[PDB]
Amino acid sequence: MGVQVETISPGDGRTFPKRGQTCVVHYTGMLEDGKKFDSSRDRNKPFKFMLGKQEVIRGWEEGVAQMSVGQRAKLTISPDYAYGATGHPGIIPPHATLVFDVELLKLE
């Protein structure tokens, strides 16, 4: 599969990230079993990335692009859109489906 976007709370419904814009997000990343492996909220610092520069996994590039500013959404991401067959040593296992709780705070 690719990325499934399920809304948690709505945004403005009008402002969607375009390629080249910087997305400012809070996020929590969990394995499919629910184990949290990464969270910007625990660090109390939002995460910024530039859309279209492949600084994030493909599921984020295609998923966050479907969110409007202010929206909080649950992204479910299959391994091909994520860390693949290889995964990430000691953090992400092979062939992992990942779940992200993502809030799009603003665009820069």
Look up the CATH number of the domain holding residue 21: 3.10.50.40
Question: Which candidate in 47, 49, 57, 77 is catalytic?
Answer: 57
Method: X-ray
Half-sphere exposure of 27 (CA within 13 A, CB side): 22
Q: Given in angstroms, what resolution was this structure solved at?
A: 2.0
Look at residues 103, 77, 97 and name the one whose alpha carbon lies nearest to residue 8. 103
Question: Coil, helix or strand for 49?
Answer: strand
- Residue 2's identity, in one-letter code, is G
Question: Which candidate in 47, 49, 83, 92 is catalytic?
Answer: 83
Question: Range of 87's domain?
Answer: 2-108
How many structural domains are present in the chain? 1
What's the gap between Cα 17 and its chain centre? Answer: 13
Clarify whether 12 is annotated catalytic. no
Distance CA 88, CA 17 (A): 28
